Amino acid sequence: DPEALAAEIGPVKQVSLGEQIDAALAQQGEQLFNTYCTACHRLDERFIGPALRDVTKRRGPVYIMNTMLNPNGMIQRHPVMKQLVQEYGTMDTDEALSEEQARAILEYLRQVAEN
Ligand code: HEC
Description:
Keywords: Heme, Iron, Metal-binding. It comes from Rhodothermus marinus (Rhodothermus obamensis). The protein is an all-alpha fold. The chain has seven helices and no strands.
């Protein structure tokens, strides 16, 4: 259900996640997260947006990737995101990331959920 709607919104459609964390990829994601995402997010505390340490436990990868890559489409069309907007407010969250960058950040998010 929520991953399918996230795929339809796009641009990412599918992310097949291998069982292991790729630590080098995650490390690039850590650096990116601390450049772009900590303007508004923390791992364990609310801030401008929701806490994210366990985002990969409550959401899937297509939703997370398309939040980074198409935040406007997600805000407009995805019911989970639309509800979070009513709670946290409307602001420019688009960091103009590449898919590569977003993928690295996802790997970091997966890693911190195992800490
Ligand atoms: C402040 C300008 C933000 C920046 C920069 C980033 N995010 Fe964000 N995020 C923000 C808000 C206010 C919200 C709630 C929705 C709304 O627009 O009001 C979010 C939400 C998310 C989510 C969804 C969390 C959930 O539990 O489903 C994710 C996965 C997310 N944000 C990720 C994320 C990442 C990885 C960022 C750096 C690339 C990032 N956001 C930037 C506010 C802001």
